[PDB]
């Protein structure tokens with residue numbers, strides 16, 4: 001079975017990989033943000049939306065991963081070979097969940113197409129040589145003849 | 151945050167806990183069953199249903215957990231540091247995912263009501279003394 | 293004072309004793325079952341029914357007994373007198389509470405009249421020589437309303 | 443399960459805790475009093491009331507507890523260990539049943555509303571400095 | 585800034601000081617009483633009244649003070665300085681909070697005017713020579 | 727009793743905790759600001775608002791806490807014991823009161839809804855990687 005967690009939400013793992021790790025908040029900051037904005041919906045008996053359902057699982061899975069990793073770290077041989085487990089989370093599964101949690105939280109806040117446009121805008125900005133690009137990053141929340149039809 | 155994965159699906163962790171561990175298929179057998187019955191839906195770009203959305207994540211999370219567990223296990227050469235890891239998976243996170251995967255797969259197949267009534271029927275059957283109970287278990291499809 | 297806990301429910305200690313100890317689930321399994329079927333009612337501010345009131349007290353009383361028995365067991369030095377306390381619970385008060393808890397839970401589920409007729413049916417079945425009786429026990433659910441104002 | 447015996451009767455464990463231990467009659471005196479006032483109703487085939495149902499179980503439970511404690515207590519040899527059981531009963535489960543038995547007996551006699559306001563009245567009287575408070579306690583019946 | 589906690593409630597620190605220390609219940613007994621009478625209002629999302637708001641902060645401030653005093657007491661080497669910390673709380677901030685907690689709880693129960701007249705009534709009674717005064721204190725609820 | 731000081735003001739301790747410690751002005755700077763903006767109201771015999779009532783108690787509670795801390799500090803001879811007491815308030819109760827004083831002062835100035843939206847705005851901004859976020863923080867007065 002080849003399941004892409006982003007496919008049902010109009011994205012792909014390959015698209016989220018266009019963003020380097022430095023772009024994403026930490027998991028703990030993503031989790032704290034999910035609580036501050038969406039705790040009541042996330043804890044409710046109502047589906048709310050597919051992003052809500054998915055985000056619920058991602059949060060619980062991270063708990064699963066940390067419980068197992070902590071149990072491994074609390075009973076493994078060298079209290080120096082924990083730096084390896086911590087590093088393995090940071091270099092591998094940590095970035096995956098930063099991508100995933102950021103994706104659902106930001107989609108719930110700004111909508112999929114704003115999220116997907118910002119994904120490419122920032123991924124292009126950060127690949128432009130710093131001496132040739134605008135000093136500040138593009139901004140996620142951003143975006144006459146209104147008078148004619150008054 | 152205290153999230154119960156079953157709450158949006160009309161159940162609770164405690165209700166699933168009413169079923170003994172011996173009740174559930176293995177994770178591998180649940181995953182192969184999800185593929186045989188629902189692969190095309192699980193792999194499609196359509197949400198399909200909230201159970202589909204949840205099951206997609208549960209399957210992927212298991213991969214995450216096993217990747218971590220195997221990588222830890224393949225870099226241990228003491229089988230007292232190795233069989234312990236397998237035992238921890240079997241007794242702890244393995245049982246959680248057997249409950250979760252069975253719940254979503256069976257709900258997709260039979261409906262929540264049927265699943266919730268069978269949870270109670272079987273949990274009560276198995277707690278009845280074997281000499282006083284029907285020799286065969288109740289049947290989910292009915 | 294001579295109080296029979298079953299008398300207000302149209303039964304008697306003697307009638308409940310017609311079932312052998314082998315018939316009843318364990319206390320733990322009756323407690324799990326009461327929670328699985330009736331947790332919300334048992335925890336509510338509503339009486340619900342005399343069976344609910346009784347089952348509430350029975351559950352808490354068992355807690356009292358286990359607390360006392362555990363405190364006694366933690367202050368006994370002989371590890372064979374600790375097993376004697378365990379045996380005293382199982383042979384004496386344990387059977388009493390298995391009878392009582394089963395009675396109230398089954399009555400809430402199937403009704404008093406079904407419960408009492410099953411009591412007699414199973415009690416007669418188990419007393420029939422195994423070579424002369426049906427190979428399987430009778431079944432509670434196969435047997436074929438006061439509002440309690442106050 | 444978290445069951446509060448007083449909740450279905452419009453009270454709580456913590457509310458009964460507002461009264462000091464010295465406020466309650468002894469278990470024996472409560473048992474004598476239930477017998478003197480309500481023996482016939484308690485022994486009848488009529489439910490009579492939720493308080494009757496509860497009090498029936500509380501009385502029998504105390505019997506269960508005393509049988510166990512007596513069976514334990516009659517099998518020790520050190521008279522400082524025997525008294526240790528007596529102290530543990532008095533400090534713990536004895537106070538719980540004094541609270542419970544008084545509550546149901548007093549409710550049957552005076553009504554829940556009178557009982558609850560007396561719990562508050564006496565609880566406040568006993569917490570007032572003795573040199574500042576009325577020389578006699580408040581009275582349940584009035 | 586010179587803030588008197590009683591000023592917005594029609595009283596003053598000097599007026600509460602007219603009652604001797606022995607008049608007031610202990611902080612523990614005031615906290616238990618606030619819970620018994622007003623727990624639901626105090627914990628509710630509704631302001632309810634300025635007394636509710638003030639009492640909410642007073643309770644939490646006492647928690648803060650006890651946390652600090654406990655942390656200080658557990659890190660003092662000299663166990664005679666620890667008892668000194670205990671004495672300083674009882675003689676100083678403990679008395680201030682007995683005044684404050686009593687004031688808000690009694691105002692919620694009997695109203696401001698009854699409380700303030702009782703303050704003067706008891707303050708005058710206790711300053712009358714015991715051989716010349718009525719044997720019993722005046723009564724707040726009358 | 728479980729009282730959240732923000733609940734009657736439409737917030738919770740958890741929501742205020744979303745802001746890191748370095749977001750908040752110092753207690754002294756908050757107290758100076760309360761004096762410069764609201765001294766006459768805080769000292770007046772009028773309730774003014776629940777925020778006024780709450781802020782009045784918070785200021786006096788900090789006074790209580792500092793009086794206790796100063797009395798302890800003036801009776802410690804070791805200047806490293808005094809620095810630890812100073813450090814403990816800053817790490818602990820100081821942060822609680824910085825949160826509290828800021829919340830009431832900013833609510834009186836800008837309104838609850840602006841304050842709550844700003845807590846989330848700044849809380850999200852500071853969790854965005856500095857190389858990916860706007861160089862300047864969002865502005866409370868918008």
Ligand SMILES: COC(=O)C1=C(CN2CC(F)(F)C[C@H]2C(=O)O)NC(c2nccs2)=N[C@H]1c1ccc(F)cc1Cl
Nearest residue numbers: 275277278282283315317321322325397401431432433
């Ligand atoms: C809700 O309780 C029940 O449904 C019971 C049935 C439900 N039955 C369980 C079954 F035996 F498996 C068949 C089924 C039925 O009656 O159809 N049978 C019996 C008994 N039969 C013989 C001795 S006890 N007892 C209760 C019961 C069982 C297990 C438990 F943990 C708690 C309870 Cl209250």
Ligand SMILES: COC(=O)C1=C(CN2CC(F)(F)C[C@H]2C(=O)O)NC(c2nccs2)=N[C@H]1c1ccc(F)cc1Cl
Nearest residue numbers: 173174175179180183251252255256259289290291292
């Ligand atoms: C779609 O899955 C099923 O149909 C299930 C059946 C279908 N039943 C299988 C059967 F037990 F063989 C009879 C049949 C039925 O209900 O008719 N029974 C049970 C359970 N029954 C008792 C404990 S679990 N669980 C699921 C299931 C079984 C195996 C598996 F690998 C994955 C799943 Cl989701």
Ligand SMILES: COC(=O)C1=C(CN2CC(F)(F)C[C@H]2C(=O)O)NC(c2nccs2)=N[C@H]1c1ccc(F)cc1Cl
Nearest residue numbers: 567569570574575576607609613614617689723724725
């Ligand atoms: C709810 O508070 C009260 O009812 C008060 C009474 C009610 N009275 C208690 C009584 F003294 F017993 C008589 C009764 C009354 O006024 O009728 N009297 C007094 C005081 N009287 C003298 C000094 S303090 N204070 C309060 C009170 C008492 C105890 C406590 F723990 C907390 C409080 Cl707020």
Ligand SMILES: COC(=O)C1=C(CN2CC(F)(F)C[C@H]2C(=O)O)NC(c2nccs2)=N[C@H]1c1ccc(F)cc1Cl
Nearest residue numbers: 465466467471472475543544547548551581582583584
């Ligand atoms: C039958 O119940 C009663 O009438 C009670 C009275 C009623 N009367 C007792 C009295 F104290 F003598 C006055 C009188 C009344 O209220 O008029 N007072 C009190 C209490 N008062 C203070 C602490 S407990 N408790 C119950 C009671 C008393 C003794 C006993 F063994 C069992 C019970 Cl349930």
Ligand SMILES: COC(=O)C1=C(CN2CC(F)(F)C[C@H]2C(=O)O)NC(c2nccs2)=N[C@H]1c1ccc(F)cc1Cl
Nearest residue numbers: 023025029030033105109140141851853854858859860
């Ligand atoms: C609710 O989530 C957000 O509003 C996000 C913003 C909101 N923006 C934060 C800001 F950078 F400060 C500006 C603001 C805006 O878009 O106006 N920006 C970004 C990112 N920008 C660049 C890289 S990630 N990601 C999310 C976010 C940020 C922090 C966090 F802990 C969790 C999340 Cl989901």
Ligand SMILES: COC(=O)C1=C(CN2CC(F)(F)C[C@H]2C(=O)O)NC(c2nccs2)=N[C@H]1c1ccc(F)cc1Cl
Nearest residue numbers: 749750751755756759763828831832835865866867868
């Ligand atoms: C009256 O209080 C204020 O106006 C506040 C401003 C007003 N702003 C101060 C400014 F940052 F300088 C710009 C201005 C504005 O919002 O327009 N900003 C902020 C904060 N912003 C980020 C973290 S705290 N907090 C309060 C405040 C500031 C200092 C102080 F001593 C006490 C208080 Cl209550």
Ligand SMILES: [Cl-]
Nearest residue numbers: 294295296299
């Ligand atoms: Cl009888």
Ligand SMILES: [Cl-]
Nearest residue numbers: 603604710711
């Ligand atoms: Cl004096």
Ligand SMILES: [Cl-]
Nearest residue numbers: 627727728729
């Ligand atoms: Cl609470």
